[PDB]
């Protein structure tokens, strides 16, 4: 069981122990954020037009 990489300082120490070794763009974002706002605006336009009927 091998200990390695030991670094000590006045605050503590760190080290390693090996038991065994191995064996979108800003414009694309703007597009989809605005595609959604159009589907919202469209659906609201169906609401108001139906309420207009």
């Amino acid at each position: 069981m091998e200990v390695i990489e030991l670094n000590k300082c006045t605050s503590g120490q760190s080290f390693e122990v090996i038991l065994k070794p191995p064996s979108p763009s800003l414009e694309e974002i703007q597009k989809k954020l605005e595609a959604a706002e159009e589907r919202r605006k469209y659906q609201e336009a169906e609401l108001l037009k139906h309420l207009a009927e």
Binding site: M1, V3, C9, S11, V17, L19, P21, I29, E37
Partner: protein, 437 residues
């Protein structure tokens, strides 16, 4: 020295952010006014704690933090709370209409109206950084803001800060304390959209934090305050290497290096010990061996799952207090004989160890006892995929009937973003399975 900016999104993220910053001030000797008697370099310095605090000419230490919510209720408590003077008013950003537990409302309708403002307030902190390391993002999976606005913000951060590391502290949803029936929808949506923009993510399951508070703190019904103090001790364990002197996990890139060998499997499991009630008058202090052994008990994990039935790709031990390397290696040797600790074949079987001699700080009057030594284990085990299995199932039950989808479609989202997000999660669970059998 390289700076780190903390970003707290939604109710969970803000309230957890307050717990952490309160604890950070106590550990570093910074008072609620921002004064730090121990900083002899007035007005500046490239000390380790400057990774998280900037200094004013007047000697004030100000968190490198922005708090963001789509409603003012929660951040207003920061504006009037004991640490109000700590934060510059520009760091506390508030909307008027929250996301209504709706990912699509946070990401698309309300999110798109405030994203530009948030990124400029963030740019203001980046501009006071001599070399910006990256971001720590705190948020819930379950809230409409925590999930929907966070993923919108993570996309923009990748665009505006391409070379910079992004880490996550994510509150996984639990029914004992949840606020909404649709938290499974928001979790999958925000995970899918964020996965590529996050280098490392520490999940905390509210179910785990809750039971630890009941079992070990004798809190009959834990509140958000109980959970956040325990959660902030763990976050402080994870971030101590960035704020203190040492050689392990000194920058955000080391977290990926040491814990995430494969990019999509980037959710290390955190296990924390010892958690002792402040009410216990007589407590027998736990040795290095006892607290280290406790790191392999599922009842101390931030997510309940069984690492015996998974495989390890990485494992770090973060000790604080009276701990020396010899006791650790002694502890490991005996734990290795007695436990099912299987590493994937293409990774060494080993533990990277970090020891900070300052024993954990506890909030005066909190529920946590002061202890002589404590440890936080970060292991990347495939066992954490059990949490994805749980969540994806709950998602599947509702989505099969399309229950509640109209609230998302009504905000501008498309039904196919649900199945697309679900498919990504199917690929993720499959990844963990290939890496773990």
């Amino acid at each position: 020295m390289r700076e780190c900016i903390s970003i707290h999104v939604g109710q969970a993220g803000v309230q957890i952010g307050n717990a952490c910053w309160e604890l950070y001030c106590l550990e570093h000797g910074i008072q609620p006014d921002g004064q730090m008697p121990s900083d002899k370099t007035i007005g500046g310095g490239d000390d380790s704690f400057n990774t998280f605090f900037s200094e004013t000419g007047a000697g004030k230490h100000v968190p490198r933090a922005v708090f963001v919510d789509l409603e003012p209720t929660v951040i207003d408590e920061v504006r009037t709370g004991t640490y109000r003077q700590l934060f510059h008013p520009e760091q506390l950003i508030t909307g008027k209409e929250d996301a209504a537990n709706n990912y699509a409302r946070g990401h698309y309708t309300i999110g798109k109206e405030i994203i530009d403002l948030v990124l400029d307030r963030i740019r203001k902190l980046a501009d006071q950084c001599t070399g910006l390391q990256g971001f720590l993002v705190f948020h819930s999976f379950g809230g409409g803001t925590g999930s929907g606005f966070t993923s919108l913000l993570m996309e923009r951060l990748s665009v505006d800060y391409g070379k910079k590391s992004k880490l996550e502290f994510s509150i996984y949803p639990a029914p004992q304390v949840s606020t909404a029936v649709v938290e499974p929808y928001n979790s999958i949506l925000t995970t899918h959209t964020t996965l590529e923009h996050s280098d490392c993510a520490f999940m905390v399951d509210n179910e785990a934090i809750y039971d630890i508070c009941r079992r070990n703190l004798d809190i009959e019904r834990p509140t958000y305050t109980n959970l956040n103090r325990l959660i902030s001790q763990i976050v402080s364990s994870i971030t101590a290497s960035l704020r203190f002197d040492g050689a392990l996990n000194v920058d955000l890139t080391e977290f990926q290096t040491n814990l995430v060998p494969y990019p999509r499997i980037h959710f290390p499991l955190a296990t924390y010990a010892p958690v002792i009630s402040a009410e216990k008058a007589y407590h027998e202090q736990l040795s290095v061996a006892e607290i280290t052994n406790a790191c392999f008990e599922p009842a101390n994990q931030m997510v309940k799952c069984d690492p015996r039935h998974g495989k390890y790709m990485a494992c770090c031990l973060l000790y604080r207090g009276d701990v020396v390397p010899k006791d650790v290696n002694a502890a490991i040797a005996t734990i290795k004989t007695k436990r099912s600790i299987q590493f994937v074949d293409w990774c060494p079987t080993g533990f990277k160890v970090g020891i900070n001699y300052q024993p954990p700080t506890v909030v005066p009057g909190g529920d946590l006892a002061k202890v002589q030594r404590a440890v936080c284990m970060l292991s990347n085990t495939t066992a954490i995929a059990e949490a994805w299995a749980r969540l994806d199932h709950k998602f599947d039950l509702m989505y099969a009937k399309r229950a509640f989808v109209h609230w998302y479609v009504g905000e501008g989202m498309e039904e196919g973003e649900f199945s697309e997000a679900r498919e990504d999660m199917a690929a993720l669970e499959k990844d963990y399975e290939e890496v773990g059998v």
